[PDB]
Design a protein around this ligand. Structure first.
Ligand code: ATP
Ligand code: CA
Ligand code: MG
Lengths: 372, 125
């Protein structure tokens, strides 16, 4: 029939597409831009709002805003503009014609979940709706019903233990350090090497250096000095201006903040310790399966060496007899979205949607149990 | 549970073994005469139902993942497993069975062992 629409609203990037597709058709920055002074002509800022890539490219004349902070919607007017844009300009379909599956961050407040439900039914007039926890979709994507998902995105990093299909809320832990923080951190240490990056285009360069040259060191200490005595770890980066530069140890120093947030004046356990902490809050019978199914999702887990470093660190914290296994799907930047695409395409899911009729009779508060 | 699917209605009614193959986002029964034959490019769901002394039914749900099955097949096999467990009131124990690492329990369901077959139904993607 009519494909369901699947949208994963990341703090940094929105992934949108049609259920049944193997990947999101549209992946764009979760930004809403508005003219500081709107015009009456082409190229002057005639539209009352811009979303995504366009808002980004028209930086010079717009005021950009991010309605999602740490995976939580904090500006509903702006969120609705992103959603409107997503349906009509990105997917190019009217929402009233399709079931819509949205994702949410672990531990998303109940008021937010109901507001989202209300907007979808009352504003976009969707015929069917469902909301899924991001980490759970990633777990399904990996072909499992049990595991502990480490989802490090742009805005937040969550550790979510899931047993037999159900997350264990009491054990979910959040680390308030993610990709945005890493880019800013690389921007600082690169700056202290004698280079300059402070504007958004410059920051975008640093983000590019982060996603292309950075890596997680297996043993930080020994790695450091291996850059001290050699130029074995140095790679050259060709700037947009032609000028070429050399990134050295900043390559592994930046992502190291994931293991030691202290480097950002942040007093929080790193991702390895937090994964152990979460597993420890779970029932014994479940821990063995969690240790054996540590699933990585999110762009910030894309750093080469991260799985090898997590395997080592977790092995050291777990009992010696414990089989520890780290699963890092190559497609983990889209794991959440793919999980949603699969879920919404299942013949068996067709009775799971909250209907318009149901919403009409019981309202938005039905979302919590309906999407449990 | 609010799930309406013909195979869900047939699931775990009498003691025995039931096998379904994931075929393009649907759960399709495997003919009984072929139980034991598994396509390595496919994913399947196996339900072993045993009659308990007190009259209750004990369930073991195994989702078998072929070495070459696509992401939609393994993802659906996992989700179908959770859904069936939920439909059967959660009385089952879920087992993930990867080609080459099947549990002794799973293998024990097949007297003549397993017959791997290269190939399978195309991805639903
Ligand atoms: N190859 C890579 N190596 C390191 N970081 C990467 C890579 N690719 C993307 N990233 C980073 O991942 C982040 C985006 O990740 P992701 O799409 O998972 O986040 P999100 O969904 O928008 O965030 P959140 O779930 O916090 O709401 C950005 O900071 C980006 O720079
Ligand atoms: Ca197949
Ligand atoms: Mg995300």
């Amino acid at each position: 029939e009519v494909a369901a629409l699947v949208i994963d609203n990341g703090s940094g990037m929105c992934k949108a597409g049609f259920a049944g597709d193997d990947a999101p058709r549209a992946v764009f920055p979760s930004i809403v831009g508005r003219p500081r002074h709107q015009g009456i002509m082409v190229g002057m800022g005639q539209k009352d709002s811009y979303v995504g890539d366009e808002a980004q490219s028209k930086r010079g004349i717009l005021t950009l805003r991010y309605p999602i902070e740490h995976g939580i919607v904090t500006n509903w007017d702006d969120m609705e503009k992103i959603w409107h844009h997503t349906f009509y300009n990105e997917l190019r379909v009217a929402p009233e014609e399709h079931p819509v599956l949205l994702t949410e961050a672990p531990m998303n407040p109940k008021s937010n979940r109901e507001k989202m439900t209300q907007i979808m039914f009352e504003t976009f007039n969707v015929p069917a709706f469902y909301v899924s926890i991001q980490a759970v979709l990633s777990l399904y994507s990996s072909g499992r019903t049990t595991g502990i998902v480490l989802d490090s995105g742009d805005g937040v990093t969550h550790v979510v233990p899931i047993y037999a299909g159900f997350s264990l809320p009491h054990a979910i832990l959040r680390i308030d350090l993610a990709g945005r923080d890493l880019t800013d951190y690389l921007m600082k240490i690169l700056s202290e090497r004698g280079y300059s990056f402070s504007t958004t285009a410059e920051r975008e360069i640093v983000r590019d250096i982060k996603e292309k040259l950075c890596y997680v060191a297996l043993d930080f200490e020994q790695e450091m000095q291996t850059a001290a005595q050699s130029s074995s770890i140095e790679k050259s980066y060709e700037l947009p201006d032609g000028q070429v530069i050399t990134i050295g140890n900043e390559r592994f120093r930046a992502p190291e903040a994931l293991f030691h947030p202290s480097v950002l004046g942040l007093e929080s356990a790193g991702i390895d310790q937090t994964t152990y902490n979460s597993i420890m809050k779970c029932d014994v019978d479940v821990r063995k399966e969690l240790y054996g199914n540590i699933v990585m999702s999110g762009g910030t887990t894309m750093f080469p060496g991260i799985a090898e470093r997590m395997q080592k660190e977790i092995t050291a914290l777990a009992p010696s007899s414990m089989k520890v296994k780290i699963i890092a799907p190559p497609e983990r930047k889209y794991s959440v979205w793919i999980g949603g695409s699969i879920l919404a395409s299942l013949t068996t899911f067709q009775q799971m949607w909250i209907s318009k009729q149901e919403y009409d009779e019981s309202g938005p508060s039905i979302v919590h149990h309906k999407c449990f | 549970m609010v799930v309406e699917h013909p195979e869900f209605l047939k699931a775990g009614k009498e003691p025995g073994l039931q096998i379904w193959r994931v075929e393009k986002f649907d759960l399709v029964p495997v003919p009984t005469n072929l139980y034991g034959d598994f396509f390595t490019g496919d994913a399947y769901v196996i339900l072993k139902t045993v009659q308990l002394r007190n009259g209750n039914l004990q369930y073991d749900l195994h989702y078998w993942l072929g070495n070459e099955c696509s992401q939609d097949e393994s993802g659906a096999a996992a989700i179908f497993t959770v859904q069936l467990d939920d439909y059967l009131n959660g009385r089952a124990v879920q087992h993930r069975e990867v080609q080459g690492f099947e549990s002794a329990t799973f293998l024990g369901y097949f007297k003549s062992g397993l017959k791997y077959k290269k190939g399978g139904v195309a991805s639903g993607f």
